[PDB]
Design a binder for this molecule. Structure first.
Ligand SMILES: [Mg+2]
Ligand SMILES: [Mg+2]
Ligand SMILES: [Mg+2]
Ligand SMILES: [Mg+2]
Ligand SMILES: [Mg+2]
Ligand SMILES: [Mg+2]
Ligand SMILES: [Mg+2]
Ligand SMILES: [Mg+2]
Ligand SMILES: [Mg+2]
Ligand SMILES: [Mg+2]
Ligand SMILES: [Mg+2]
Ligand SMILES: [Mg+2]
Ligand SMILES: [Mg+2]
Ligand SMILES: [Mg+2]
Ligand SMILES: [Mg+2]
Ligand SMILES: [Mg+2]
Ligand SMILES: [Mg+2]
Ligand SMILES: [Zn+2]
Lengths: 84, 115, 60, 177
RNA sequence: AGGGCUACACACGUGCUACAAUGGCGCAUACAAAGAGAAGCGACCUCGCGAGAGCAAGCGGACCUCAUAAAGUGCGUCGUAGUCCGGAUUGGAGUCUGCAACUCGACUCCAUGAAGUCGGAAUCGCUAGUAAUCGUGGAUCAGAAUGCCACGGUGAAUACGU
RNA sequence: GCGGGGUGGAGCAGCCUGGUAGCUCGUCGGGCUCAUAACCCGAAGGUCGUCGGUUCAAAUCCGGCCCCCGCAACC
RNA sequence: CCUCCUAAAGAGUAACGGAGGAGCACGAAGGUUGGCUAAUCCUGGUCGGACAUCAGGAGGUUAGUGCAAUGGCAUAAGCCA
């Protein structure tokens, strides 16, 4: 993982969008591309759309996901099992 | 003989015997026998009950078999329910740390299920 | 009770680590020594996450 | 006679004030403890029932009654008259002396004990439980554990409800969760 | 910009690690060859269990660093067990590279300890400093070797004959 | 009317005497050959035509029936 | 040869009428004395599940009877010694 000495990564556009969305309540989904953003304690309650290559996922942020990256909640590969 | 609610082999050394309280390997074994001052080479056949309960006190300073089992299952349940990539990867009984799944990855997948 | 079939039932000393020394009858024939007891157990006396560790490890 | 005198000296008085019963006769008693063992894998191993019963005597201090199949069953491959288990009925002094050890020595030695369930009163206050390993009792020589067998404990009582049975059983320090 | 070439019922080639005792683990201890380095090799010293961190010398190098060679040796134990074998997988806590380790990085520590107990049909390589085994370095390259390329140490077996 | 048999994809042993499913060819996986066939090594596939009854238990026994069938039908 | 129906409330009563069984078993499965009471489900229970054994409730013969059916059977003729 990212070494602690640097602090948790976050993308500027993501952070400023959640910021001015924080101060304005739970508005529309904040369609994001930065699947590499780490989740922050203030996003609890946010619904943010994340990219899987072609789509955006309606991912409601809970307390329990804090600390992890955003991209772990939008599967990029679609596999419904072999020989279906 | 009875350490952390379980039994340890009476015919083995101390280092080796303590490798059976699920949650302590060799390093923690040397650490117990340092914090308690028993030579690593002695077989617990040759202890006294007081040495044995001192062994119990020094192991009591960690998360062990019941603690470790259920706390681990709690972490994997957090993963299960998070729906994160590790969530899907444990729901799937697939590998979870990005190893190749075109080839063997069999420790997870088990034996072969030919088509 | 019938004779000739039941085990030998007599009283030995179940010694615990805590200083809990109780007399029971038992089919062991020899003394007991215990690691846990009704008054030295974790449960019998009361010995029995992401924002938190975040703030513990990540300062902004 | 330890926990029996504990009943006659503390528990009758506690439950005479909890429920304010008319007389002592209305206070629940612990009337028998039944220890059973299903040894159904003894279809081809008759030595198995007569070894797993050799442990129930050591646990109980008392020779058990080999129990037989009531009916024919092609499901689990048995026949009426085939003995597929063993039980002991404990009463009086030896019941109390078994019960006290069950409290003080036996349940402490269970792998990952988290508190006995309170969901095992059958509507009339009687408590059964499982013991998934015969080495929580020390009378077994752990060096001659020739198999890992369990047993059901059943504790019957004059308690009339689940509530009264969990109460009577709670003036006796049963570790409910 | 993100995602994919890193998927996954399966089948195949190519190698690695083992299944142990001619070996594993603790201790000390010996003899290489070759080769790289300036947006670099980076010692001493201090700090962290460790990967590494800090500050800070030398070197465009038969001078400085890379960089303690492992096998081996001796001492102790293990005493044939799914084991003081095996190290997959998995959880937690980590370091570092680069904007950036979710998909999808490389190493650390702790915990876990899976198959595996010498491999069906078949099939490959080698006639000597060879196979076999044991470590070393280089190119690529911010990081990312069980591959390739290159280097030594030990060191065999057997060849009637066609 | 009397009397048969039905069992993995195909063809048949297993039944009489209730337990303890087989052979041969086929299918799939891998070998061998330049490739195919032959040849070699593994493996998977039937709880027995529907079903009632009796039973400890049914492919086996009985029968309502179902398919395929054979001998009888005369003065 | 046995049981039931036809068979018309005593007995008996036919048809190539409607339905089933027997050609045994048991030295205990006979005698006697003492004792005992089923099916089924429900709740709780280590394994263990629709279904094993344990414990308790509901239920009251829906069980059981060495083998058909009918009549009987608790004072049991059923179950154990
Ligand atoms: Mg990878
Ligand atoms: Mg590719
Ligand atoms: Mg050079
Ligand atoms: Mg390099
Ligand atoms: Mg190992
Ligand atoms: Mg480790
Ligand atoms: Mg194995
Ligand atoms: Mg072995
Ligand atoms: Mg090498
Ligand atoms: Mg690199
Ligand atoms: Mg004519
Ligand atoms: Mg008449
Ligand atoms: Mg008349
Ligand atoms: Mg007449
Ligand atoms: Mg007839
Ligand atoms: Mg009588
Ligand atoms: Mg009689
Ligand atoms: Zn105690």
């Amino acid at each position: 993982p990212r070494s602690l000495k640097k602090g948790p990564f976050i993308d500027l556009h993501l952070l400023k969008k959640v910021e001015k969305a924080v101060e304005s309540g739970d508005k529309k989904p904040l369609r994001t591309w930065s699947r590499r953003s780490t989740i922050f304690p203030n996003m609890i309650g946010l619904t943010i759309a994340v990219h899987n290559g072609r789509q955006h996922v309606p991912v409601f942020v809970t307390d329990e996901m804090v600390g992890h990256k955003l991209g772990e909640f939008a599967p990029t590969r679609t596999y419904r099992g072999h020989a279906a | 003989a009875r350490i952390a609610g379980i039994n340890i082999p009476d015919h083995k050394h101390a280092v080796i015997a303590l490798t059976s309280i699920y949650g302590v390997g060799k390093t923690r074994s040397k650490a117990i026998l340092a914090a308690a001052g028993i030579a690593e080479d002695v077989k617990i056949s040759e202890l006294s009950e007081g040495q044995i309960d001192t062994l119990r006190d020094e192991v009591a300073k960690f998360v062990v078999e019941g603690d470790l089992r259920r706390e681990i299952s709690m972490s994997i349940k957090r993963l299960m329910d998070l729906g994160c990539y590790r969530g899907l990867r444990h729901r799937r009984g697939l590998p979870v740390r990005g190893q190749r799944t075109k080839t063997n990855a069999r420790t997870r997948k088990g034996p072969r299920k030919p088509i | 009770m019938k004779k000739d079939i039941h085990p030998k039932y007599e009283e030995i000393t179940a010694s615990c680590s805590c200083g809990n020394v109780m007399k029971i009858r038992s089919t062991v024939g020899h003394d007991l020594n215990l690691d846990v007891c009704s008054k030295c157990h974790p449960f019998f006396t009361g010995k029995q996450g992401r924002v938190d560790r975040f703030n513990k490890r990540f300062n902004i | 006679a330890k926990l029996h005198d504990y009943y006659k000296d503390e528990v009758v008085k506690k439950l005479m004030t909890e429920f304010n019963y008319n007389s002592v006769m209305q206070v629940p008693r612990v009337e028998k403890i039944t220890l059973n063992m299903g040894v159904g894998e003894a279809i081809a191993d008759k030595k198995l029932l007569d070894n797993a019963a050799a442990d129930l005597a050591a646990i109980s201090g008392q020779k058990p009654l080999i129990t037989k199949a009531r009916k024919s069953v092609a499901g689990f491959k048995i026949r009426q008259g085939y003995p597929i288990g063993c039980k002991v009925t404990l009463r009086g002094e030896r019941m109390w002396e078994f019960f006290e050890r069950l409290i003080t020595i036996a349940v402490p030695r269970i792998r990952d004990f988290r508190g006995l369930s309170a969901k095992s009163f059958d509507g009339r206050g009687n408590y059964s439980m499982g013991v998934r390993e015969q080495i929580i009792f020390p009378e077994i020589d752990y060096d001659k554990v020739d198999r890992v067998r369990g047993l059901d404990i059943t504790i019957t009582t004059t308690a009339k409800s689940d509530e009264e049975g969990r109460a009577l059983l709670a003036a006796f320090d049963f570790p409910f969760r």
